[PDB]
């Protein structure tokens with residue numbers, strides 16, 4: 821059993837580490853808006869959207885009961901971006917950098933949470 825504030829204290833720094841990447845977190849800060857961006861095929865390809873603002877809200881509102889549920893949403897965000905965007909694109913390469921940072925930050929936190 822993990823208490824909400826235990827999860828918030830342990831995991832929020834790992835989310836802040838992603839937000840600190842600039843420009844690399846910029847495409848991920850808010851839900852993808854396909855009409856605004858001019859990419860109307862987005863939801864044909866990405867069935868379960870996820871982004872940093874949604875993860876932050878979930879962490880602030882106790883929606884994660886175990887740390888793996890948070891890890892899963894971060895990875896869903898990355899997998900969506902590697903699925904949708906081309907390998908040469910900014911968003912894909914920025915996703916790869918966020919995945920590197922997240923891997924580095926989450927490991928000691930998972931060890932601490934036991």
Ligand SMILES: CC(=O)N1CCc2c(c(N3CCCc4cc(-c5cnn(C)c5)c(C(F)F)cc43)nn2[C@H]2CCOC2)C1
Pocket residue numbers: 843846847848852857859900901904905910911914
């Ligand atoms: C995560 C995902 O799959 N998305 C889908 C594709 C996408 C996203 C963004 N978004 C989201 C809005 C904020 C944003 C900001 C930047 C940005 C601003 N300043 N800097 C230095 C970078 C970039 C840029 F990296 F492309 C992209 C995006 N655009 N697109 C393409 C549409 C036109 O072009 C690329 C989201």
